[PDB]
Amino acid sequence: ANPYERGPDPTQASLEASRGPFPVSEERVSSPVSGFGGGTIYYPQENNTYGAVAISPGYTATQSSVAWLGERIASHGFVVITIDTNTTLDQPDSRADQLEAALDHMVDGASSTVRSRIDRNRLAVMGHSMGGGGTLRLASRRPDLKAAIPLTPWHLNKSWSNVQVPTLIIGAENDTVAPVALHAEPSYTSIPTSTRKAYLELNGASHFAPSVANATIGMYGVAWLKRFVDEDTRYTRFLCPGPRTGLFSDVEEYRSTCPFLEHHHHH
Numbered sequence: 001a002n003p004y005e006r007g008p009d010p011t012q013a014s015l016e017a018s019r020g021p022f023p024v025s026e027e028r029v030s031s032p033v034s035g036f037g038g039g040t041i042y043y044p045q046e047n048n049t050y051g052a053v054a055i056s057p058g059y060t061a062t063q064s065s066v067a068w069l070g071e072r073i074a075s076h077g078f079v080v081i082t083i084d085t086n087t088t089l090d091q092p093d094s095r096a097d098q099l100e101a102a103l104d105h106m107v108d109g110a111s112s113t114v115r116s117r118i119d120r121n122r123l124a125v126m127g128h129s130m131g132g133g134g135t136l137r138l139a140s141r142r143p144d145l146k147a148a149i150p151l152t153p154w155h156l157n158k159s160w161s162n163v164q165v166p167t168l169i170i171g172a173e174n175d176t177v178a179p180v181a182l183h184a185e186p187s188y189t190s191i192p193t194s195t196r197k198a199y200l201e202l203n204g205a206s207h208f209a210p211s212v213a214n215a216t217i218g219m220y221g222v223a224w225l226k227r228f229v230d231e232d233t234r235y236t237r238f239l240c241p242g243p244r245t246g247l248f249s250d251v252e253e254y255r256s257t258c259p260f261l262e263h264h265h266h267h
């Protein structure tokens with residue numbers, strides 16, 4: 001059976017809840033750290049190896065705008081760094097470099113407590129807005145990553161025809177900053193159909209929906225990471241065919257390259 005599985009069997013209820021099943025502790029990153037502005041590493045207290053996730057905030061924002069996400073995701077069994085960027089005005093491709101440097105810091109710069117809890121073969125990135133653009137760029141050039149989740153992404157580039165990393169893009173229907181028509185949707189469509197991918201558009205939502213605790217983002221974010229960072233097929237049933245859409249849905253639409261096919265071993 002899958003040795004990367006962690007935590008009890010998921011339900012809709014457990015994934016929509018404020019916290020996952022794992023108590024978490026934090027490590028503040030040193031002042032001058034190489035390649036990014038600083039951050040907070042959230043890690044399960046329970047001594048095991050977990051996947052690791054770097055999360056970038058957006059233009060004019062700090063780690064505080066994605067702090068909820070780092071704690072919520074860590075509590076489902078992941079090591080998560082929420083970064084500050086060099087400056088709050090850094091553009092998406094700079095945020096891509098800073099996400100990569102944060103991954104390097106978790107495996108090669110953090111305490112033994114942190115390094116010992118990471119399976120460094122199993123890594124993911126996430127980001128809000130320009131951080132979401134950074135997620136796409138880094139994914140484009142690191143096909144070794146297990147997952148990428150751009151949240152209401154902004155990037156001047158719409159063409160991601162090289163991305164092989166399983167990618168879940170969350171768009172916000174009423175986004176006026178990074179309209180899904182100009183960013184999320186063309187970016188999604190350009191990703192090769194051979195890539196495991198999905199696009200979840202939040203009904204009614206604005207650009208800033210990922211900057212505060214959201215049950216839909218939390219549920220689908222966690223389930224994506226479980227499915228791909230942990231290869232956890234207990235989570236496939238939430239992703240494929242995916243959430244109910246329409247008028248009383250929190251989801252306006254959902255696209256995917258479902259089904260998501262598994263590999264396996266015999267004991």
Ligand SMILES: [Mg+2]
Binds near residue numbers: 001002003265267
């Ligand atoms: Mg086994």
Ligand SMILES: [Mg+2]
Binds near residue numbers: 246252
């Ligand atoms: Mg709608």
Ligand SMILES: [Mg+2]
Binds near residue numbers: 180185201253
């Ligand atoms: Mg749409």
